[PDB]
């Protein structure tokens, strides 16, 4: 029979770097109905966002 004892100390020094590039499109919509005592309106909107 045999017994083994072991100790281990590890020093790990690590580097990392990164880039990233995002390209974002977007198409918005809107409708609106306004009402008053005597004033009524309506509105339609649309939006085109690049990024």
């Amino acid at each position: 029979q045999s017994t083994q004892n072991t100790d281990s100390q590890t020093r790990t020094i690590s580097k990392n770097t990164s880039t990233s590039r995002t390209h974002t499109s977007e198409v918005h919509g809107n409708a609106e109905v306004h009402a008053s005592f005597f004033d009524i309106g309506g509105s339609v909107s649309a939006g085109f966002s690049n990024s």
Partner: protein, 53 residues
């Protein structure tokens, strides 16, 4: 909106720890032949043993 970027959470791989235990090392011990000398006459004898009157 703001992009996630994603730098990741996982660091390195187990494969280094896996390789650590993966150690095989050296096994078995010397046996059988050893040295072997030996010398004596317990096998056969030699002495005058005849019969007469």
């Amino acid at each position: 909106v703001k992009k996630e970027a994603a730098e990741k959470l996982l660091e390195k791989v187990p494969s280094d720890v896996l390789e650590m235990y993966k150690a095989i090392g050296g096994k078995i011990y010397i046996v059988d032949g050893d040295i072997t000398k030996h010398i004596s006459l317990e096998a056969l004898s030699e002495d005058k043993k005849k019969i007469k009157d």
